[PDB]
Design a protein around this ligand. Sequence first.
Ligand SMILES: Nc1ncnc2c1ncn2[C@@H]1O[C@H](COP(=O)(O)OP(=O)(O)OP(=O)(O)O)[C@@H](O)[C@H]1O
Ligand SMILES: Nc1ncnc2c1ncn2[C@@H]1O[C@H](COP(=O)(O)OP(=O)(O)OP(=O)(O)O)[C@@H](O)[C@H]1O
Ligand SMILES: Nc1ncnc2c1ncn2[C@@H]1O[C@H](COP(=O)(O)OP(=O)(O)O)[C@@H](O)[C@H]1O
Ligand SMILES: [Mg+2]
Ligand SMILES: [Mg+2]
Ligand SMILES: [Mg+2]
Lengths: 464, 238, 97, 503, 186, 395, 50
Amino acid sequence: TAGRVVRITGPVVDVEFPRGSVPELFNALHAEITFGALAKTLTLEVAQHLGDSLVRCISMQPTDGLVRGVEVTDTGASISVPVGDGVKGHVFNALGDCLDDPGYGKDFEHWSIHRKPPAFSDLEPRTEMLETGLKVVDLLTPYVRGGKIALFGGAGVGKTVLIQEMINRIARNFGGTSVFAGVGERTREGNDLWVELADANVLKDTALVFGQMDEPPGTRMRVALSALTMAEFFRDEQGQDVLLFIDNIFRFTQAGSEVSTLLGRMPSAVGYQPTLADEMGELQERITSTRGRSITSMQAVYVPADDYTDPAPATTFAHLDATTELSRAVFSKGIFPAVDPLASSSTILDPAIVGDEHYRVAQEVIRILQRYKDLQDIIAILGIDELSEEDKQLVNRARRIERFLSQNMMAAEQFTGQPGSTVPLKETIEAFDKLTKGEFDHLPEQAFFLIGGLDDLAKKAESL
Amino acid sequence: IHRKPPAFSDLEPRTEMLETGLKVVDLLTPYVRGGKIALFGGAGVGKTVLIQEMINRIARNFGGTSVFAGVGERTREGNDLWVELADANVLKDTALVFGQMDEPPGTRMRVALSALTMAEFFRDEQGQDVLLFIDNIFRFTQAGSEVSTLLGRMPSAVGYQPTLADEMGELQERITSTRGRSITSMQAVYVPADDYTDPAPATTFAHLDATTELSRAVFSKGIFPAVDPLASSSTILD
Amino acid sequence: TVGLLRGERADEAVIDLAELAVSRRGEVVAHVSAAAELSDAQRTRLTEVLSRIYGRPVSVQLHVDPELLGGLSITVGDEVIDGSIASRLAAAQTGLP
Amino acid sequence: XXXXXXXXXXXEEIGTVIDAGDGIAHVEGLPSVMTQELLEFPGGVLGVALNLDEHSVGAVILGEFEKIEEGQQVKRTGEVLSVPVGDAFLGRVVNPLGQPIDGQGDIAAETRRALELQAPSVVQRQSVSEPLQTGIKAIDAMTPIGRGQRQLIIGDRKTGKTAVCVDTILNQREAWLTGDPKQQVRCVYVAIGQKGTTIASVKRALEEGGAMEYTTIVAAPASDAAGFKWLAPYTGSAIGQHWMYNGKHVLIVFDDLSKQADAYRAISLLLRRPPGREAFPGDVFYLHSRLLERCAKLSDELGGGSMTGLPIIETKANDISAFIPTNVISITDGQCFLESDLFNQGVRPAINVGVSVSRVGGAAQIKAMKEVAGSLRLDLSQYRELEAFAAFASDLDAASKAQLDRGARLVELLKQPQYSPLAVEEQVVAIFLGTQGHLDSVPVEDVQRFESELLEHVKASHSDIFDGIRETKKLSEEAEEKLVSVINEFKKGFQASDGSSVV
Amino acid sequence: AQGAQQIQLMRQQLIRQLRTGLGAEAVNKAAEIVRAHVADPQAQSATVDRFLSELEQMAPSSVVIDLRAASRQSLAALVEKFDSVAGGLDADGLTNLADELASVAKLLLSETALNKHLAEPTDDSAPKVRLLERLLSDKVSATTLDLLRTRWSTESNLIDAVEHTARLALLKRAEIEVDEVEEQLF
Amino acid sequence: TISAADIEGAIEDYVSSFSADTEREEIGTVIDAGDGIAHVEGLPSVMTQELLEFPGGVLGVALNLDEHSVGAVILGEFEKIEEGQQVKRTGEVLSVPVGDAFLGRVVNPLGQPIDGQGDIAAETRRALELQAPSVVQRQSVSEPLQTGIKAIDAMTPIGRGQRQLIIGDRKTGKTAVCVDTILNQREAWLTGDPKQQVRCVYVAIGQKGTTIASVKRALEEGGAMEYTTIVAAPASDAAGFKWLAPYTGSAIGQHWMYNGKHVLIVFDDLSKQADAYRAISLLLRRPPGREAFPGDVFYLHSRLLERCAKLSDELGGGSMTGLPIIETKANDISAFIPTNVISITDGQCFLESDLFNQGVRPAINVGVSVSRVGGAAQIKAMKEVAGSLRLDLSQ
Amino acid sequence: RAQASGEVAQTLTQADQQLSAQGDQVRSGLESSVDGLSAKLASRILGVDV
Ligand SMILES: Nc1ncnc2c1ncn2[C@@H]1O[C@H](COP(=O)(O)OP(=O)(O)OP(=O)(O)O)[C@@H](O)[C@H]1O
Ligand SMILES: Nc1ncnc2c1ncn2[C@@H]1O[C@H](COP(=O)(O)OP(=O)(O)OP(=O)(O)O)[C@@H](O)[C@H]1O
Ligand SMILES: Nc1ncnc2c1ncn2[C@@H]1O[C@H](COP(=O)(O)OP(=O)(O)O)[C@@H](O)[C@H]1O
Ligand SMILES: [Mg+2]
Ligand SMILES: [Mg+2]
Ligand SMILES: [Mg+2]
């Protein structure tokens, strides 16, 4: 005995079941579409109970071709993804289907994507700094080994460049095992990544799960859970340390809104779903470094219309330990990676963790840039000349500090042709201390763009 | 609690100035004895202090009677007022009614009308002039808006009940001083989001002879009592 | 009844028909569950008890099930007696410090 | 026993419209209809069955909804939302339903393809490593477009977007005349919300240039119902995909994609779905991405075909930070922002060299152009800032002045007239003239003439330059020396509109 | 001092761990002992008897109750009119009235507008009675029309009342076997 | 050392004490479930805001009582719920366990432990919606809550029985200030005098687990967990816990308060409570008011904060001091929820990032910040040396 | 500070191992009592001296 479809509205499908055989929430159901070249087996996920033995489900595939009255069979379990050391090296989708080898993973151990987060008693905060080799990050927003990092920004400001750069900075040398969740990003980038990780030979040590934009919202929101399951398996069972890249996690909340509008739930503010914070929290709290093991996560967050006050970014800000924030304005200045020094933040930027020499320089730089950002309102009208000398001396080196935060990243080599640069922390501290104290105030601003370290600064200045 | 306001036949305008001893008030926003006076202000600029100062300055010299309506105000300042009035002798002649914000919408709506019923008794049945203080009369329409969507009214503009104008008028028109029997009303008004355009202040402004409009911009400069000299206005400044 | 169901569920409809039949008989009906059928004397005693727990006399329909390994459970109106020993095992398990 | 009784009890469909309003209808019956099935009504009107309720079916009406009324019979077509497709569409103007609107005749369709067919997955695709020559100097030099790329043409009202895309379509004729499908690009021009006269003008321009041998137009003019505007991009991509999976190369222009957003806003609000930002429904992203992800280059295991997309977006007062602009910028692989403040001065096409980017980059640029032009972008950006500075410099060093004049002459070089696409073999020379400094002696006011004449000089004599470039896609020294000799020989024969010779 | 406090904390946690382990094994073994005891109906019936004694000890009835008041009163008036009709009726005439009431129920559900009009309760119901009679006297037995000559709040309940009267009539015909009908219905 | 006698005695005492009342009680059935909401049929005798008991041990609050259904918010894991299953009534209006055994624990909003250190020997149960003390029962704030922060204790003092909103933007020093205020109380706690030692409650709403743990161990570093309780409604938990945590915190506080103790309550942060209440109300399909917030979002905070005050000597003289935190999107104070809390509380400490970034730390904007009880909550000496510092710095 | 922290760590570890051994000692004794306690609990559940 099994159920029947009785309503269809986009990817959302209502199914009626016998009186006593209603499926539990988040159970997976199978249905058939038999029109033609469009035919396929649909997986539906139970999202609600509507009463009278009727339940409302989210389709993981496009419903096109689904006719009313077709039978629907309950699997009795949630959507299950393959887990195991054999997962590494291959590409998967949200439903556990391998794309590189269709039959792969059918015989592996299967874990449910829906799981409760770790007990509070097993949580412990991390403080060990992670050295990436980017000046602005390592100085003002030091990442945490085993913490949660995020890259915010609008459209067309450097999510992908900086994300693959950080892949080169961490994953290229990380001794552990990596997972890459592509949540609603463009597919061409996924193919580029699948090729690049093989060129660099890193592929054999990382797993990829993709849910790109073309897919309907129902799976577009579950892809994150699908990959997080493999990440937390590598965490809890194998005991390895893990890197969990996710791009872009805003599309998870966007798919949540799309499915919400169909489920019939009333809209919140500007038009997101209610429980937005609850879904995002249920997702993010699972990505945590429990005692004795670690899962380092770098997330990308989209920001529509550059409205940093949009409820979704404003919500996701709460779950992150490090938050690099890109900006349109800094990008227009030609600065790259275009990080906003005053908006970005990191919780471990305190003297007890990073040391006094680092903290003092970071805070002096922040003070200089803040005074600059306050004088901008006059700078824009009357130019620098109107300012008093205590302000003009400050602005002259503020511009230089700002431009020196730029760096010639390895990823940009494919566009600019200039090779990449990695700098150690101590050299960055020395350089910015010298800058704030004025040992380089005599050089022109254009000398500072996209340098790298200090020796490269001298080499470039000599040529001008 | 509920009674229709006095007929238009019995109303006359008031033109006797009330001296308070506040430089800005006495100069730019002269008050009217027997009129309707209001303080306006966003959150935190000090309305509750200024209204207690008006109690200190008027009700001390005032030989008549007085009533204080706590409409959705915070309780600590009501207790401070109850203790202060008993430290002086004024309490012998001052009635107090409290419907503070710890209570649900019903009491926040009807407490104003109850204190106003007491004031109307003093006005009509005795003729002894009286001072009616209300703090804060925005919580009345606020509670109305809170209950609106549950009663079945469709929400209007930024989110007040549609009956706002008439629901507020049925109250305000009762505080009037009919001829030969005065009520001096002093009511504090909250301005949401410091938005003087919000429908509630915009509707309240019409029922008042003098408005001592506080502003956060002045308060941040340390100017205290922080009255905005430009926005504040009075009809007796002729 | 089937000719005029007008939207109700068949099972609930027939059960309401039975409830009407018994009410018109002047009694009420309770649903009883236990691991084994009680004896005739036991049923007469059960009726004698329910006639003291409720005013008008209560008739009974027995839904035997091995879940209630011991004892019996009674449902009437929308009130219930949780007398089964399995509920006692569940309680002792959950009540543990 | 129960089973047999149940079977005994259990022992061409036509529906009826119960409700109709403003481009949407509700239909009774049709128990066996598929979701998004193309229903048909008595008036010769079609519909899309979006919502299937327990008692009625919601159908968005395509075309003249005026002809629908309560009590009309509705019948199944038996086809999921689909359009006819084939090679026969080449040279025809069709409405989103695949029906001919030009009155030129019937369509000898090959087959039918559904619109909701999913894009090719990560494993099926290939890198964008193949040049889609646009013929605009300001684009092929600095922002090259590869086959399988999505290049946004975002700009302001009246800034030459449609002109640029028509030039891109016209440039492909030099390739069409070769029979090999690997070069033989074919095109589709999807017109959404454009004026009928503008579509007619595009039709005429393409006919005059010979582009209609290989271009298909899908017309959803402003007069028609929102549903046509909503479908036009999807039916255009459906026409393209059939060629794409067969191993052809396709170029899709969407002019303009913001009005599909507006049409879907209308449709959604008529269905009473709760709107989001800018009153748009929450799923406009799944509209534009569902459309643009279809564009790809396929792996050779699937046919080496590709489809290139050039979506146009109209920006309110150059506010590139708006909702739909940022949504499409987040989907496409680059943008060529056409600034109006430059268009009115005469910089045409008005490509903003600072904001424009090609996120594929020089991978799809031929080696000749890659060497000659690859420096131009940053040089022009620094020239623009140098000009912004020197605009109020009472005096400045000679080096700044020389860089300023070089920049001004490069800017004057980049612009070109409408409907005048230049082959890459000529674009490389046109940019060589500037980057290598041979223009350093010609007055600005003549530069645009100078280049346009020299390309004809090299066209009549010393053809081995263009041929050597074309046949190897790199500019060899044995040709560069003859090029420089021809340039210096021409400089003596050329003359300005006023003043002296050009040395 | 904080270190020593943590020592004491770990000691308490150890006490808790052994305590919970003991309790869990205790309850599991008690479940085993219970299921071992409950293996024959001699235990089942005895346990039911013990529960019966405990329920005899239970407090006496304390709830009188064990779609709205106006509709309920209309249903009770229908019940009284049926009491009169049945006092007059017999099993054969009872079945005739039941069939007539089932037919009139089918009519009322077919002609929805009539139910929507008639179901509105008002004083001066006599003209409504005449409207009813003009059709009830033709296709319905005199007794069915006499009972039908009877205030309900909604058309759904007014229609259900006809089925109610028909059930009452057929059950009374059965009574003229109450236990048999009840048992077969269950 | 550990002994067998204690373990054996506890196990045997439970075993011998075990008994079941076998009481008759009312039953209902779930007809709808989803997003943390459940519609239950039956339960005629159910009280408004009664605790319903679902079969997986999960609890719920009956907020809506319709003519044919009861609307309940599930306070726990809603995944286990199924349509058609049984639901019991508890016979208890929404209440939480309270007792001085909560000191040092971390508890779910329902008052059950999540620190893992075992069950809590609760003293009694207290309803979460008891009425605030009236104008007559209260007393004038006249004694200081020493924060140890110069910019506050001198310029904008906090007194016992005072409400001082801490209103800032992201990463400005809200949690820092409140944690420091809790830490500074040890020098008074160690005196053992109940009339000056301050007991603390840190309510975490919407905080991520590792942040709650960092706060916990920062308090342990300073010995604050000897007198501090933590009510943790982490991000993962359903909107119900997130909406409820402030009220259970206030109840745990009010018990000590009315027993004659002095209490301090930090809410971190009430904007998350407003968001959770919005979510719950929208799932129950109440028509929202301005900015999609529930119509009565003000009454959510007012009856939470007004319930902290100083009692008169006739009720033991105890007090409860609140320090609610508000997070302001894009550093505008003139918004809906911040301007509500500003009007419910007695004073504002406004933390501005543009001051934090220029060395002024804690980043108290001296102009907007105020303490309306003021110098009455200060020792004489500070009133002398700091009597006008706020106005002078604003000028 | 360092000296006191080292002493604290030593105390913690020594107590850890001692408590492990002591718990191992006592739980063996508890294994004997558990069965009688279970019989008592079963007697409570059934309502008779099982
Ligand atoms: N290459 C060119 N050089 C100079 N001017 C041009 C060129 N192309 C177009 N224009 C100008 O722009 C007009 C046509 O522009 P076009 O139709 O491309 O604008 P558009 O971006 O399509 O605006 P809309 O979308 O509103 O039609 C021409 O009539 C001409 O004035
Ligand atoms: N008084 C101070 N002096 C110097 N640094 C400080 C001070 N107070 C806080 N900080 C630092 O600034 C950062 C502030 O983070 P904080 O703990 O205040 O987050 P928050 O304000 O609680 O934000 P959220 O409410 O979102 O957690 C921390 O890294 C902390 O070390
Ligand atoms: N250092 C740099 N130099 C030059 N261009 C850069 C640099 N960093 C990033 N970019 C450009 O920015 C673009 C980033 O796009 P992307 O981050 O993918 O946007 P989104 O993620 O919003 O789609 C790239 O195409 C790249 O060309
Ligand atoms: Mg990206
Ligand atoms: Mg155009
Ligand atoms: Mg905080």
